[PDB]
């Protein structure tokens, strides 16, 4: 992995994680966000908090993290620490008493074309209006609002990966049944 | 502190002290680490969780011949207080903890004497497994 060593040394020689990763500042950073729900940990009706285990798949392109594979022994993909690069500052706006942003900085998958995939985990504690009128036969509509805290739409654009959250790896609950799910 | 600053400069920068390496002349030797425990207070024994919470002070004593000096050459200085991150440490941990707190709580300064003895008394709050006989 001398090829990848040289590549990683070249890509980060004069790299800035401060500036947006675009060739020209008038361009917008196009970010694809997809939420995957692994587990519905808890529904606290008294404090109106829903605790979920999630994976926040984020995909974008970094203009300055490209290379030709032929110049590096055919290396087409690498995994690098996420802390070294610029990332979108996605925040759970309706965080109740958990973390506002991602705190588990897992590795990003970088392609030679500059494409970045970053799928960090999170424990989302979200504030949900809980209607107890019909308990124990109650239905609850609980939301997770996600947005770039400091970047507006004119510099960073976020787009849903899919119209629905990813429930392919969802662990069945013994207390709730997700009747419907959708991202807007 | 011309003297203590000059002594630390002599020990760590002039002689190139490497805290990653053990204080042995050859690799096949073993470092003798003397341990004692002082129980400051027995905080509790929770039976339902079967957990013993104690406040203890672990006295570590070992020899580091790299950290020797002549007291008369350095203003009759006989003891130094140094951060523990500056010296090699015999990293002792509580093996039978039940909460993931393997290490001491407060990494206090090491006391290094001119004849090469390193004394270190970190205090710790430890939560340990204690199976309970309810008979």
């Amino acid at each position: 992995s001398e090829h990848e060593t040289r590549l990683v040394a070249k890509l980060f020689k004069d790299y800035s994680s401060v500036v947006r990763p675009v060739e020209d500042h008038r361009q917008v950073v196009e970010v694809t966000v997809g939420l995957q729900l692994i587990q519905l940990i808890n529904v606290d009706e008294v404090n109106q908090i829903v605790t979920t285990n999630v994976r926040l798949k984020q995909q974008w392109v970094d203009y300055n993290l490209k290379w030709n594979p032929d110049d590096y022994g055919g290396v087409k993909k690498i995994h690098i620490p996420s802390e070294k690069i610029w990332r979108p500052d996605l925040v759970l706006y309706n965080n109740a008493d958990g973390d506002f942003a991602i705190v588990k900085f897992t590795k990003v998958l970088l392609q030679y074309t500059g494409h970045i995939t970053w799928t960090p985990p999170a424990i989302f504690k979200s504030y949900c209006e809980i209607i107890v009128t019909h308990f124990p036969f109650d239905e609850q509509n609980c939301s997770m609002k996600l947005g770039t805290w400091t970047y507006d739409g004119s510099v960073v654009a976020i787009n849903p990966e899919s119209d629905q959250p990813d429930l392919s790896n969802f662990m069945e609950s013994g207390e709730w049944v997700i009747k419907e799910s959708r991202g807007w | 502190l011309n003297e203590e600053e000059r002594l630390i400069r002599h020990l760590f920068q002039e002689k190139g002290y490497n805290k990653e390496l053990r204080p042995v002349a050859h690799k096949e030797e073993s470092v003798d680490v003397a341990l004692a425990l002082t129980l400051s207070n027995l905080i509790s024994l929770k039976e339902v969780e079967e957990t013993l919470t104690t406040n203890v002070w672990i006295e570590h004593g070992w020899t580091d011949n790299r950290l020797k000096w002549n007291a008369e050459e350095f203003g009759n200085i006989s003891v130094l207080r140094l951060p523990p991150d500056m010296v090699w440490l015999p990293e002792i941990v509580l093996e039978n903890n039940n909460d993931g707190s393997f290490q001491i709580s407060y990494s206090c300064n090491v006391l290094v004497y001119h004849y090469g003895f390193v004394y270190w008394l970190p205090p710790a709050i430890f939560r340990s497994s204690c199976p309970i006989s309810v008979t």
């Binding site: 992995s1 090829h3 060593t5 990683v8 590096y72 022994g73 | 990653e20 053990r22 042995v24």
Partner: peptide
């Protein structure tokens, strides 16, 4: 431990702990 020190210095000269060690590109 001066032999150990020299060996460690040689071992970690040019070493990158973030790069997966694959002898050749494509190796697992």
């Amino acid at each position: 431990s001066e032999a150990e020190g020299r060996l460690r210095e040689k071992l970690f000269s040019g070493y990158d702990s973030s790069v997966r060690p694959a002898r050749e590109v494509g190796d697992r």
